[PDB]
């Protein structure tokens, strides 16, 4: 269906410990495919997905150049932010930037993004029109006017509308055997007595990709949303994800409960129950 490509960047200043640590990773949908860490021996962007390894040396050289440049300009931007906020040189600060694009099922741009955060808070973000900005505070409003004057949004738009989707489509095609092959969850319900009168029913979804999934418990066909414990979807470490949803039920009533699983890797929604 729909897909995305995102590059995440984080620079963290470290006063009496050298230059800002700079880490950036690239994803297509939920798949990490490139990484660059400035604390690496002789830093280079490295592949993290098989389908990107085929890109030639010029691709890798350009990526690494961009990463190295960004690490350096992030240092300047951190200095500017420090100045705007009148902050001490002694403290550690963080500058994050995410940018990327989403394409529809037809491979056309659905939305472009380019946004920044300072110390974990929105700082400035390119709006969906890709031609205006949202500044989160008075400092960011200063930056916004500079960027307006310098026509930054036009340049970002050019990228987001052009190369970003072009390369995303390329990756989608080159990695289609994995990126476009949703892996449905392996599912099962476990039962854990918490006393002689109640038991937890835990509906598990494991090994699924992409991460999006819905797990719900019903009792006699009615959603038990307010009483369901749902853990945050979590990476299994092999590119797939896990999630479970649990409900505590009166002993004797277990068979009234069904777990419902929605995931794009399933042709149809699953309904499971505890099968002792």
């Amino acid at each position: 269906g729909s897909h995305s490509m995102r590059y995440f960047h984080t620079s963290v200043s470290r006063p009496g410990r050298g230059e800002p640590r700079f880490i950036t990773v690239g994803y297509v949908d939920d798949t990490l495919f490139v990484r660059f860490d400035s604390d690496a021996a002789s830093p280079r962007e490295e592949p993290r997905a098989p389908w990107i390894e085929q890109e030639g040396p010029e691709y890798w050289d350009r990526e690494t150049q961009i990463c190295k440049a960004k690490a350096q300009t992030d240092r300047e931007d951190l200095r500017t932010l420090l100045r705007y906020y009148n902050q001490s040189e002694a403290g550690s600060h963080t500058l994050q930037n995410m940018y990327g694009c989403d394409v529809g099922p037809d491979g056309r741009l659905l939305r472009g993004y380019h946004q920044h955060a300072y110390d974990g808070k929105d700082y400035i973000a390119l709006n969906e029109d890709l031609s205006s900005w949202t500044a989160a505070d008075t400092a960011a409003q200063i930056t916004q006017r500079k960027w307006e004057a310098a026509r930054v949004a036009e340049q970002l738009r050019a990228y987001l509308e052009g190369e970003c989707v072009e390369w995303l489509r390329r990756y989608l095609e080159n990695g289609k055997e994995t990126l476009q092959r949703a892996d449905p969850p392996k599912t099962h319900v476990t039962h854990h007595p918490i006393s002689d009168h109640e038991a937890t029913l835990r509906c598990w979804a494991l090994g699924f990709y992409p991460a999006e999934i819905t797990l719900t418990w019903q009792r006699d066909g009615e959603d038990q949303t307010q009483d369901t414990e749902l853990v945050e979807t979590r990476p299994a470490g092999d590119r797939t994800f896990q999630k479970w949803a649990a409900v505590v039920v009166p002993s004797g009533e277990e068979q009234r409960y069904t777990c419902h699983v929605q995931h794009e890797g399933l042709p149809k929604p699953l309904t499971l129950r505890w099968e002792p």
């Binding site: 590059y7 690239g26 890109e55 691709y59 350009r62 990526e63 961009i66 990463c67 440049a69 300009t73 300047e76 931007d77 500017t80 932010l81 705007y84 940018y99 200063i142 930056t143 500079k146 960027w147 310098a150 930054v152 340049q155 970002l156 990228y159 190369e163 970003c164 390369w167």
Partner: peptide
Amino acid sequence: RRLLRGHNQY
């Protein structure tokens, strides 16, 4: 692949 562009000061 990444965006290649100039640096714009904050």
